[PDB]
Amino acid sequence: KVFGRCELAAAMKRHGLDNYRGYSLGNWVCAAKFESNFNTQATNRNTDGSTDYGILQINSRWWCNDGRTPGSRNLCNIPCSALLSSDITASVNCAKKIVSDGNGMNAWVAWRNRCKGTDVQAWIRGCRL
Ligand SMILES: [Cl-]
Ligand SMILES: [Cl-]
Ligand SMILES: [Cl-]
Ligand SMILES: [Cl-]
Ligand SMILES: [Cl-]
Ligand SMILES: [Cl-]
Ligand SMILES: [Cl-]
Ligand SMILES: [Cl-]
Ligand code: NA
């Protein structure tokens, strides 16, 4: 599913991501924009052999199981395929664990490089939330 911007903001809020760990909703929407362009089915292979899955490009090195990432963990206790669903529940629940892991949203390199410090409220501007 390719979400609309406000549609995704609303779904993230529904699932308790707004201000989670102090990160406003616009931070999450901005991260999703640059990770997946709001496409739940996005996948990308990393140089290390791991793969990133879903709207927030969650990595199989630590967070989900895909059966083909040697030496990896599955700390969200989910198949990586769950992160591609039109229903964002699994991605949101896993993102909550990731953002709590110590480095906040810097876990998402694209958030650090493209969202951090910017006017992230622009991403939810105009939305009925
Ligand atoms: Cl957009
Ligand atoms: Cl915001
Ligand atoms: Cl594996
Ligand atoms: Cl393969
Ligand atoms: Cl594990
Ligand atoms: Cl699994
Ligand atoms: Cl949803
Ligand atoms: Cl933080
Ligand atoms: Na894994």
Side-chain angles (χ1 to χ4, degrees), residues 5 33 37-38 123:
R5 177 178 62 87
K33 173 67 178 183
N37 205 15
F38 304 148
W123 293 98

Side-chain angles (χ1 to χ4, degrees), residues 77-89:
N77 305 305
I78 51 166
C80 297
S81 64
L83 298 168
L84 305 182
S85 176
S86 53
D87 181 326
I88 68 169
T89 300

Side-chain angles (χ1 to χ4, degrees), residues 10-69:
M12 288 177 155
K13 176 173 182 180
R14 174 90 293 262
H15 291 82
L17 208 52
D18 56 312
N19 220 21
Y20 189 88
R21 283 286 165 147
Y23 288 93
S24 65
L25 190 54
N27 280 285
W28 296 103
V29 175
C30 183
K33 173 67 178 183
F34 296 123
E35 292 295 356
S36 66
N37 205 15
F38 304 148
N39 188 347
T40 69
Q41 297 195 83
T43 61
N44 290 284
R45 196 80 184 261
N46 301 314
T47 55
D48 73 351
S50 65
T51 302
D52 289 347
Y53 297 86
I55 53 163
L56 286 167
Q57 291 289 281
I58 290 173
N59 189 263
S60 64
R61 171 68 177 81
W62 290 106
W63 305 109
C64 61
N65 177 57
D66 66 9
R68 69 167 199 195
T69 310

Side-chain angles (χ1 to χ4, degrees), residues 30-31 34-35 105-116:
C30 183
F34 296 123
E35 292 295 356
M105 288 193 73
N106 299 287
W108 290 272
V109 170
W111 175 86
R112 178 172 57 78
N113 288 332
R114 306 182 70 175
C115 300
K116 182 181 190 179

